[PDB]
Structure 1
Amino acid sequence: GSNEFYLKTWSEWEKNGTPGEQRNIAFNRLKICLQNQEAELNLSELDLKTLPDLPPQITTLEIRKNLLTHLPDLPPMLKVIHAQFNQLESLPALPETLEELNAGDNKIKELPFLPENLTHLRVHNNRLHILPLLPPELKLLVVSGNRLDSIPPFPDKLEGLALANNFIEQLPELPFSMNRAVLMNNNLTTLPESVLRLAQNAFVNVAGNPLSGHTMRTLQQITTGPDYSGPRIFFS
């Protein structure tokens, strides 16, 4: 009786697409997914312009490389969303179980609240001007190629950061957990002193920033010194 609601909706949705949309293949996968109570729904690369109500038991939603502009409500056990290479203008409210969200190469203008269990956020090549407050378990933040004017404070387990090709004017202090920081092509004129305290194996790319003369001397007095044991910093 629950299944009939879904089969009916998917049935109705299958007949209302444009002829490029591979709705028939999608309908069959949704069917197999619901009836086998499958963990992953894979509708990727099916030229879809909308999605219907989704099977409620899934933990992975694999919908990359479609033509979606919005998503339906996200099922409340989802752990991984691969939504990159669509035309999304926004995302719906994110489930509390969500751990990995990839929505790179979309048109997203703002993100919704980021839930507390999120560890990987990949939203490069969007239209973001601001980021939500970053949750405490975040390990990877990829936001390169947006329109970011500023970036929130970094939580203390963040290990990878990419924010290249934005408009950022100030960089918050970097946690020692950071091993990889792509800061290239922003509007920075100074760097936080914590950059020099990152691990010796850490990498920082700060090319394409208008770093001031005093910044350059301050840093290179340390990075060019003989006893320097901080990260490798690329300035150009």
Structure 2
Amino acid sequence: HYLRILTEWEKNSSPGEERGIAFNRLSQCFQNQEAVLNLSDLNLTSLPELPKHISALIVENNKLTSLPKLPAFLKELNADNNRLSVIPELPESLTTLSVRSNQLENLPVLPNHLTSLFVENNRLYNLPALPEKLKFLHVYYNRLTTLPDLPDKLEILCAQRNNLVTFPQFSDRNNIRQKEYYFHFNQITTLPESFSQLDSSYRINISGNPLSTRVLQSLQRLTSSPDYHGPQIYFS
């Protein structure tokens, strides 16, 4: 019976907090056993206990700094445009985790059934073990220098505007489907030969990075050969 607590939370709406609207929204979901909880755009500075039945919480565009425990059956979490300093435990049920536009410097352990991870515009310094189920990863606008080894089924990887200095190790063509990886504006000087073994399914943008003249010549010679059907590559 935290419904009274829900009311209390409302009574504690600091000037600007639209806690009442959320109170109604939360009550409705609880009474109707709803499955979608979105308290975004409510100027919330805190969040009351969440119903364990919900599997999708949308709380973006708010002034949150920490999040209550997440239902063990959650599958999608949207906390963008928040000042979150840390994210609570991730349920193995979670498949989508977007907390961009935050101040996260480290990330909790990632379930192995997660397919979407958006953690851009953060102060992340190191990323946790990446689950293979993840097909999309956005880690841009962060201060990362060492990307963890990429999973096998990684389709999109936007890892630009970071402090990366060394190119990452791939799955060695464990995936034969189209793949777009972005590594531009990162401080990389040299690259691995493993790249020479990747198919044209790979699309890589390394433009802006401080690559060495040697690699430039090499890669320029590679991109000027008809026999070369290697990965679509971009550089500058």
Please classify the TM superposition score into its range, dividing by the shorter chain length.
Answer: over 0.9
The match for 1:205 is 205
Counterpart-to-counterpart distance in 2, 1:206 and 1:192: 13
The match for 2:185 is 185
The match for 2:116 is 120
1:44-92 alpha-carbon deviations (Å, 9 max, x no partner): 1111111010011011111111111110001110001111111111101
The match for 1:46 is 42
The match for 1:58 is 54
SS at 1:76 equivalent: coil
TM-score normalised to structure 1 length: 0.94
The match for 1:29 is 25
Counterpart-to-counterpart distance in 1, 2:197 and 2:29: 49
1:109 aligns with 2:84: no
Q: Pairwise mapping of residues 1-236 of structure 1 onto structure 2 (< 5 A)? A: 5-175=1-171, 176=173, 177=175, 179-236=179-236
TM-score normalised to structure 2 length: 0.94
Contact 1:173 1:193 in 2 (8 A): no
What percentage of aligned pairs have identical amino acids? 48
Please list every run of 5 or more consecutive structure 1 residues that lacks an aligned counterpart in the other structure: none
Equivalent AA in structure 1 for residue 168 of structure 2: P
Counterpart-to-counterpart distance in 1, 2:187 and 2:103: 23
Aligned-residue Cα RMSD (Å) equals 1.4
Equivalent AA in structure 1 for residue 144 of structure 2: L
Please list every run of 5 or more consecutive structure 2 residues that lacks an aligned counterpart in the other structure: none
1:159-216 alpha-carbon deviations (Å, 9 max, x no partner): 1111101101112222333611110111111223343444435421111111111211
Counterpart-to-counterpart distance in 2, 1:71 and 1:110: 15
Counterpart-to-counterpart distance in 2, 1:102 and 1:192: 31
Equivalent AA in structure 2 for residue 179 of structure 1: K
Counterpart-to-counterpart distance in 2, 1:223 and 1:137: 32
Number of matched pairs: 232
